[model samples]
Every structure is written in C-alpha cells, then in structure tokens.
Target: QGLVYCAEANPVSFNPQVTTTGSTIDIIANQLYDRLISIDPVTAEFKSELATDWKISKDGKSVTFTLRKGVKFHTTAYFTPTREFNADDVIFTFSRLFDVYNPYHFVGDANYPYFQSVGIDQLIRKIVRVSDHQVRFELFNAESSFLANMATDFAVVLSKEYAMALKANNQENLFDQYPVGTGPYIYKEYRRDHLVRFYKNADYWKHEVALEQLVYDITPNGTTRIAKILTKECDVTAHPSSAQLSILAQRDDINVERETNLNIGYWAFNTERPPFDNLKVRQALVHAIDIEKIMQAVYYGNGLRARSILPPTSWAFEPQKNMPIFDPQLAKKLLTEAGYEKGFDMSIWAMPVSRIYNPNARKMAELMQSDLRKIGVNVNIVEYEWNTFIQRIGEHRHDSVLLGWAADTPDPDNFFSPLLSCTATFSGKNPANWCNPEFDLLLTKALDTTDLNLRKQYYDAAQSMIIEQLPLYPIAHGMRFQASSADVEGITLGPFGAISLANARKK
Candidate 1:
C-alpha cells in the first residue's frame, strides 16, 4: 500500500540538527531518520532504538551506550556504505555540532538551533568511541535531561561513511540535501515547497513498513489540507484547525485523533526594548487582554487557559491558583504607575502560518489590539512570510511577537530553560529576551541534581519568578488535532507533538 500525507510546510533542511521547527522535523526526523533512543508515545518512558542499553555515571558526568550491531545504513543512488551502524557514525553525528575544529563541522551553517537552545553543545565535554559498537559521552556537568534530549527528534544518527564520501567528492555541503539514514524509508526526492517522496527501504533493519511509498504533499492551508484528505487524495493529514474538526468528524472516510499537546501559545514582549523593559508596563499589557474571549472565539472552547509555561502533563508542573485576572481599570492603573499614563505606540507581530497552538494568529492579534487600545496603548500589527517572520523574531526586531513552542522532550527544562534561560536569550532562542540570574541558577541546579523532588522545587520557584516578571504572556494550552483516512493504521502522536510514522500502514 502507498500513503500520501499532507504536511503543513516544506522543510528548511533535511538535517534536523540545524533547524528547530516542528514542520521540518515532521517530514525529515519522523520518517527519514532514527534516534539513539525512542520515547513511548503513551507512557512517556525511554525505549531503546539504535542503542540497546545505556548506563549513566553516579556523578552524572558520563554516559556509556552499547549500540546494536548489524543495523545497516540506507543504500541509495547517491551513496552506499560498506560498514554497518557503528561507534564512528555516532561520534561523527554529535561531534559535527559540538566540535568547532572538525573538518565536517563547518558543513552548512553550523549553528545548530536545537542544541543551542538546550545548551547541549556547552554541556558536553567530548564523545569517545570505545569500540565498533560502543560509544561514551563525557559531560562538563551533569544534566538530568541529557538522555531525554538524545531521544528527541533532533538527535538522529548519520552515516560517517556518507560524510567522508561527500568530502572526497568535494561536495560536503550537499550532506543536508542528500540524507542517508537507517530508517524504514529512503529519501527519494524533494520538490521545493510542493512535495517530498520516499520509497520503502528494502533492507530496513526493522520489520517491513507496510506502505511501499510515503509521499508528503505540502499544503499550507488547513482547510485545503482537510479537503484533500476528505477527497481521498491524501491518506493522512496533520494539525487540522478546531473549526475543521466537526466537518472532518462528520465524514465517514476520515478518522480524527487528538491528545492534549505539551505546548504554550503566547505573545512575547521584547524586554530589551524601552517601555516593555518596565515590569509595570508588561504587567499592564498582560492584564489588558481578555484571554478567555480569544480562547472561545479562536480556539472554539478547545483550549485551556495557560498559567505556567510547562503544561500539566509535565512531571514538574505546578498549578497556579491565582492566575492573573483581566481588568482594563487595573491595566490602566499599572500603566500610570509605570509613568505611561499616555501609552506609547508598539508593533505586535502575528505569525503568518496556522499552528496547532494558534490556528488564527491574525485574529488573535486583532483581539489583542482592541484590548490594548482601551488601555491607551497604540498597537500596530506586523506580519511577514513564515521563514522571514522566524528570522526577524530571532534577531529581536519586533517589540512583541505571537509565537508558541511544542516540547521536543518531556522534561520540564525543555519548556523552561529553552524559552527563558540566559543562554537561550543570547542565542536567539528566547523570544522575550527576558533573563533572570536567579531563574537561571535554579534551572542550572535542577540540571545537575538527579533528585526529582528537589528539581521540582527549583522549577516551581523559577516558574513563580516567571509569572511575577511577566516577560511573556501565557495564552493557552490546547489539544493537537490530526485527521487521517480510516484505512490508515498505527499512527500515534508523540508527547512532543510529532506523529510517529514508522509503523503507520494503509489498508
């Protein structure tokens, strides 16, 4: 059987390490590659994939893994490998990101966004090959979520042989274009923003994947994507808007699956800029907007108003009993206290594309604009194409921006540190540019300790600090919805919000 899936966007690069966008990982990481470890979609526990077993040192400074032997790399038209999966490939995959002096390190833009976000590059001391199928990682300091990060979609093992072949041919830069992995599917073709095609890997290490061909049709519009699935043109589609759920459910040929996603949708204030640098000004803006109204209108009662950055699904999550209440009178008072009785004009950026967390960002921005006006703040809505929007936001070009994050790992640090830490702020990962030394110190302590209760205390204190500071306004946490053909089987959305397609089959 063949399956054609409608994906939301074209991947920026096939190399997962360089990009942080979930759309890029959906196409490349979900199908074209496999990580060292896998997370159980339901239980959220670690399971072996490439590495059979691993042991962490008591000091938490080192981890040793025993890789499974006899796993074969994908043999494709562009390249072929004589050796099976081994320690060298593992070393090559990670060293390219952490090692600045490695010859292949400069391939493409070496600024790996995910690693930079999680501080993996700074945490790891070195990677050593113990044997043909054994590897060890030495860290500068212990990190509680180190293994969990390795299991994330960004940590795919690449073929060292392929890198060497590209270097020999003086085409090292083409590695991202021609991906070679030990996955169930082989990379066949990518037609810019239109479609990407993959064929079943005949010599796949795992059992046979039922679908012979897996094709991703790039359809950015949510309505058009659902329409394609209903017409039986596509076997599966992801991130259907809340309004489309009823329409899709009424169709006998389609099946809808959903799970409360570990994500937060919010508007970030550029704290580095004036006005917003004042805590009272930021608090006034947060209190001015009515979150419930936006949730009702845009989300259609499908979302829960978020108080904390970490969702309830996280182990370290602590519920906030006194979430800020919306009051225009209080908002105006705070503005006056901040010496902004006559509020200043500021730009609010709206995301161009539809997302699971934010289906209609433009409409949400309009609602915020209306609310801010009542509080005497002049708002200007700004928008750019998706890629350009991401670039500008990272460069801190906007006064405030609408954006959200889907967790890459189940760790609470995955939500907190990456979105709020000092390192993340400097690396362009933190949109708010709001950094607190106390928060950073608590998170750092949490990373170095293995005690769960102590870690929770640290995180709880940090989240409290975040709520008080109000760098980013917490908007909502909602379910991630997807519609697929009834004939499709074995599809599951991981905790991180990426669909698992390895066992997905079309009847």
Candidate 2:
C-alpha cells in the first residue's frame, strides 16, 4: 500500500568512515562492490574474491596478498570505460582507512580499542606496496586472526581517483553515495528516501549476475512492506513484521526464509549517570525485566531468548556461561538497598525505527518502562530519529539507551570487543563502557592466537566475565524474516545479514 518506513533515517553518505552502523551504505558495500575477501554463506569459511590468493609468514605476523590481475573500477566521472584496477588503488584504499584526516576511516585514537581487540593493530604495523599486483602487511606481533579480520568491510578496497575528487570538494565523502567498485553490479540511481537501483556490471571480474537489474525499493513501514510483498510490487522485503509473518506463512504465493542472525540487542546503562551508576541498581533492573514475555508477545517467538549478551551460535561463545541472575523480588530488595526505595526518574533512550531488529521497538521500550516501574524505577521513554539517535549515542549524551549490532565478521571478537571495550568509540554500533583489565587481556590473547581451541577458550572467558557483571543487559538475538517470490532462485541467505544480488535471479 505504501513505502517501507525505516525506523532510522538514511545515512549521510556511503563513505565507510562517516557511516557508523548499518544503512544503505552497508547494503551498497555488500552488494554493489567487491571486497578483497568474503566468507562462504553456509560454512562461514574464509575465501578470496578480488584477491586471487594470499599467504602468511611462518611466524603468522605478515601476509602477502596477490590481487586479481585484471580488475576495473566501475565507470565514473574521471575513470571512463578505460581505467584498469591495480596495486596503486589497493595502497590508496588502505591509506584512506588509516588516514587520520579522512572521516570515512573508522580507525583512530577513538576506535583503537576495537582495532586492538581484534589484533588489527598488529596486522597493519606497516603496509608496503610490493609491486603492481602484490602488497605486504607488516605486523607488530605474530598474530593469527589477521586473515579473518581482512575479510571485514574495513578491508574492502576502493578507488583512489573517486575518493580524492570527493575529498577535494569538502563534501561528506560522497564515495559511498556514488559507488564505483569492481563488483558484480554498479550504482545507477538513488531516489533519495524512496528507492535505490543498481545495474549489472558487464565488466565484473566475477561471472555475470543472474539478475538483469536490481532495485531496492525503500518501503518505510512494516505493514506497508508486507502489503507490497503480498501484491507482488517488490521482489524482496527484509525483516518483515511478526504480523506479516502470520499472514505470509499461510500463503502459497511466496516463500519465507529465515536464519539465526548474528545480532544482539541490549538496554545499556550509562555507567556515568545516576541510579544506574550504582552496580546494585543496575543489577536490580536486570531482574525486573521479563525478557521471555517480551520475546513471546513482541517477537512472536521468532528468535531465542537472550541469556547472555554473546549468542551461543558464534564461535566465541562459551557453554554454560554465567550471566546476570534475574529475580524481581531480589531486584526490589536491591533497589531498597541502593537507597532508591521510592524510585528515581531516568529516561530510557530508544529509536522508533525498526533498524534494531524489533519492528515494535518502541513498544518494547515502553514495555521495559512498565517492567522497571514494578521495581520502583521511573523510566521516561525518549525517541529520536535514527541518525540523530546514533549521533547522540556516539557523543555519550544519553543516560540509558537501547541499540543492537549485526556482527561484521563471524568471530565472537567481532561481536563483543566493540560493545564493551572502553576505548572503542560508540558509533551507536558499539556501546556499554564496561571495561575490565582481565577481560581486555583475554580478548587481546584471543585475537592474536591462531589456534582455534585456544582462541575459543579466551573468547569464552571474556563473555563469561561480561555476564557475571551485567554491564549491558542482553535482550534477544534477532531472527530475520524475508518474503521472496517463488520465481526467485539462487538466493541463499547468510547469518551475517549480507545479501548478494549477484546470486539472486528472477524467473
């Protein structure tokens, strides 16, 4: 009946640096552009894409990457159908990511903890241009997680010529908006907040795309998106509502697909603020929440009830993990013990948009407010638009907030490091200023160790510690829903939330 209403507003640019969380930019990065590497959708195993192959040194500190010899950036204002891709572009891309002046580069003193936790600091000790087709990465120490980290979006290569043009104009890095990547598709047009269209790249280094053209229609609401799907106006609608699922599950005209998404949602306490500043008060709030009730009524049992902030499916999760104990009576007692027997007023920051997995996210926040009231906690629900919501979180301006993250990579380190590390900047992507010396040390060891078993142990220990302390209360793991036409083929979904347009074809 209408366009899908996004809970969050569209991002300012697709430029990697300025874009903090998921948006059209991330969708563009995953679909319209080719990264150096990507994992197998089913196996989650690492594989090369733009780079034909790669090798590591005996000490596991350095890696030598061999780029695909004949690649080309999509046609742009400067690069016509003629310019070919090479090592110079790779060097330029890395420099852009590490360049302190470039806002698109996410790494800096602010984001160092995220990098350090993942051992990206060790892998990129120095980047050297070996030759036209070869590049070398020097490490601060011998580390094993370097290769896995390389597959992340941050490692995706870009066009130097296009980047410089945007940089010269002093624009907010328009590279993401007007993408020019060596991938299976190229950016054609964007209708502001309405629709985004991509055309197949005949020059794509990989095999030709099965679909002739791809269009991402921006339907902004759950009910409207469902109506469009039912009417055959759109080929795909991602993360449909539980109400829509009830209807679509009974229909024979469409196929419903779902997977356990590597996403985690939480209610974060501003450790620096009142009421929550006390550990006992924060502990009491956890007990007051009926997460199971929220999952059943709000989520329609689509996903698992979150016991720990770290999901069990991820490689970093540990079995029999210890997390915050939930007991409302105890919660009330703790509130009294913390000298808040009469309750204290505080706002619960939330985004009305469905960007964080729950279509009824605001409703859920309201439910949380009610639950907190049972324990003498006064909660005011404050809603903000998506961009502004993210901006506020980054500035650490809110007393408390609700947010979520879809893992960038399959590793547990990707999920946990940014959220808890004190130094990791809150791009709204990472929050919870929970810092522990032992947890940090364990995470560092896990990132640098190549032995899978040893790494898992370290990750398990880190997660266990977070659970015991309850810095951020785990809400639920997101379960994704999609309505696809029966004609759609070669479409395989990934737990990581990336959809490949190249593999999607309509009959």
Candidate 3:
C-alpha cells in the first residue's frame, strides 16, 4: 500500500544541520535518514539504531560506538554504493560539521545551527575511526546530555561514498539536494511547493517498511488539508486547526491524536531595532498585550501560559515568582517614559503557514494589533511565504515576529541555548538577537559540568535572567495534533511534533 501525507510547507533544504524548521525535518530527517542512536519518545531514553552498542568513558569524556554491519544504503537514482555503512561515514558526517578545513565543509553552506547552539564544536574534541565498523568521539569536557543530543533527528548519518562521488563530478553542493542514507526510504523526487515522493528501501537492515511508496502532498492550507483527508485523497495530515479537531474526531474514518509538546509560541522583539532596543519599551509591549485573552480567543484555551522559553516539561523549568501582569496602564506609562507617548509605527510578522504552536498566527497577530492600538502603538501586520518569512526573520528585518520552537531533543540546552545564546545570534538562529554575556557563561558552565544539581542551578539562573530581560515575550505552550485515516496504524507523534512512519501500515 502507498501513503499520502499532507505537509504544510516546502522544505528549505534536505540538510537537517543547516535548518531548524520542523516542516523540513518532517519531510526529510524523519523519512530519509537514521541516526546513530534512536531516542525513545515516550521515555526520553536512548535506544540503539545504527549503532548496536556504545561505551562511555569512566570520566564521561568520550563515547565509542560499535556500528551495525551489513546495513545497506538506499539504492536510488543518484548514486549506488558498493559498500555497506562503516566508520568512515560517521567521521565524514561530523567532519563536514566541525572540521572547517574539510573539502565537504565548504560544499554547501556548512553552518550547522543546531550543533553550534548546543556547543557541539566546543564539546567534541575529535572523532576518530577505530576500525571499519568502530568509531570514537572524544569530548573536551563531560557533557551530561551528550548521548541524548546525538539521538536527535538532526544527528543523521550520510553516505560518504555518495558525497565523494558528487565531489568527483564537481557537483559537491548537490549532496544535500540528492541525499542518500541507510534509511527505510529512498528519495524519488521533489516538486517545489507541490509534492515530494519516496520509495521504500526494500533491502533495509531493519524490518521492512510497510508502505511501498511514501508521498508528501505539500498542501499549506489548513482547511484544504482537512478536506483532502476527509475526502480520502490524503491518508494523513498534521497540525490541523483547533476548530477542525472536533469535527475530525467525530468521524469514524479519521483517527485524531494529540500530545502536549515541549514548545513555545512567542512574539520575539528584534532587540537591535529602534524602540525595542530599550528594555523599558520591550517590557511595555509585553505588558500591553493580554496573553490570557489571546490564549483563550486565538488558541481556544488549548495551551498553557509560558513564563520562559523552556516549556514546563523541561527538567530545568521553574515557575516564575513574579510573572508579567497584563496592565495597559503600566504599558502606556512606560511608553511615555521611553519618549513614545504617542507611540510609533512598527510591523508584527505572522507566519503564513499553520503550525501546532500557533495554529492561527494571523488571528493572533490581529489580536495583538488590537491590543497595541489601545496602547497608542500603531501596528502593521506583516506576513510572507513560510520560507521567506524564516529568511526575513533570521535577517532581523522585522520589528517583531510571531514564531515558536518545538524541542529537537529532550535536553534543557535544546531550549535555552538555541533560542537565547550569543553563538546562535551570530548564526541567525537567535531570532531576538538578545544576547547576554552572563547568560552565555552560565549555559557554557551547564554544558561543561556533569553534575545534575549544578546544571539545574545554571539553567535556573538563566531562565530568571530571560524573564527579567524580556527579549521575547513567552505566550503559551500549545498541544500538537495530527490526524490520519483509521487504517493508518503504528504512527506516533514525538515530543517535538514529528511523526514516526517506520512502523506505520494500512490495516
């Protein structure tokens, strides 16, 4: 049987290291690749995938892995590998990331935001090939979340032979465009903003994938996606709006699943910009908007009010002692103090596509505009295509943006460092462009130490600083929902909101 899944947007790149968007990962990472270690979404524990077993040093400074032999790379139209997976592929993957001098490093824009965000460059000293099927990673310091980080969806292994072959033909940059992995699926074709098709890797080392062909129907409209699923044109769909859930759940043909994810929907202020550069102005804007009202009206009360970037599910989450109160009077007063008594004109960017975190971003932006108008601030709502929106926001071209992050890994650093750290700011990963040396120091310390107690202390302090500074106003932690046909069995949504199709089958 074949499966047709509806995706919200076109993936910017198939390379997971270069981008952080969930849409890209949903189509490419979770479908076309496998990581060294597989993370159990339910328990947040490490499980074996490509590597059958691993050993950590007594001091926790290094990890050695014994790769599974005879694993076959997908034989696709691009290139066919004569050899099975080995240690060289592992070294090539990491080398393309850390070793800047490596030829493949400069092949494609080699900026790995996720790796840089978690200080992977600083933590990993070297990755050496012990043998053809064995590899070792020596760390500069003992990182408590090392294994967990390696298990993330972005930690996908690539076929070094294919990459070298591409280089031989001087088509090195096309490696990401034409990916080959030891996954359960092979890349077939991609029609920009229309569809992506893949065929089953019949000779997969693991159990055979249930479906013969996996296709992504790139439908960005929510209502249209719902119609497609309801009409049986599509087998599965993701992130349906709240209003559509009840209707979908009542249908015997549809199976709706929901999970409270580790995510935050927020309005990020470009701190480097104008009035927002003033902390008082940023605080005033946060105060002006009624978060609870938006949560109820825009989100339909499907989310929890967020006090920090780290969601409540995170290990280091701490309830703020003094949360920001909704006060229009106080907001106006601060605006006056910042010499904006009459307010100023600025744009509020809303995402064009629907996501679980901010299902109706345009509606949320309208609500924000209404709130700001009462505070004497003139608001102009701005939007663009999903990819363009990401690029513009990353360039810091907007005054503020309505965006959110779904956790890529279970680690606390996944939330804090990627969203707030200075390294991320330089790499365009930090949307707010709000950096603090003290906060960076604390996070660095957290990664450097293996003690759980000390790590918590650092994260706690960092969260407190984030709340006080108010670079980005936390809105809510929303639940993620996905819908599929009743016959589509064995699909599960992860904490990060990506669906696992490995075991999926039509009954």
lDDT of 1 by residue, 1-507 (tens): 789999888888888888878888888886878889987767887889999999998898989999988999998889889999999999999988889876778788767877887777778889989998999999998899898889888999998999898899899988999899998899999999899999898887777877899999998877888789988998888788777889988999889987777888988999989988988899889889998899998889988788787787888888765567899999999999999999989999998677767877888999999999998899999998776688788888999999989988778888887788887887778899877888889989998787999999998988788788878887888788878999999987755746668888877
Off by over 4 Å in 3: none
Clashes of each: 0, 12, 0
What is the TM-score of candidate 3?
A: 0.97
lDDT of 1 at 381: 98
TM-score of each: 0.97, 0.90, 0.97
Candidate 3, residue 405: lDDT: 89
lDDT minimum window of 10 residues, candidate 2: 1-10
RMSD of each: 1.4, 3.5, 1.4
Task: Residues 1-507, candidate 3: write the lDDT tens digits.
Answer: 899999988988877778888888888886788889877878877889999999999998989999999998888887889899999999999878888766788676767878877777788888989999999999988988788788888889998999889889999888999889888888999998999999888988888788999999999898999999999999999788788888998999899988878888888999999888898899889889888889888788888888777789888898777667899999999999988999999899999877767888899999989999998899999999888898788878989989988887778888778888888887777788878889899988887777878999999988888888888888888888899999899887877635678777897
Report, for every candidate in turn, its global Cα lDDT versus the true structure. 0.86, 0.68, 0.86
lDDT of 2: 0.68
- Measured with C-alpha atoms, the lDDT of residue 498 in candidate 1 is 63
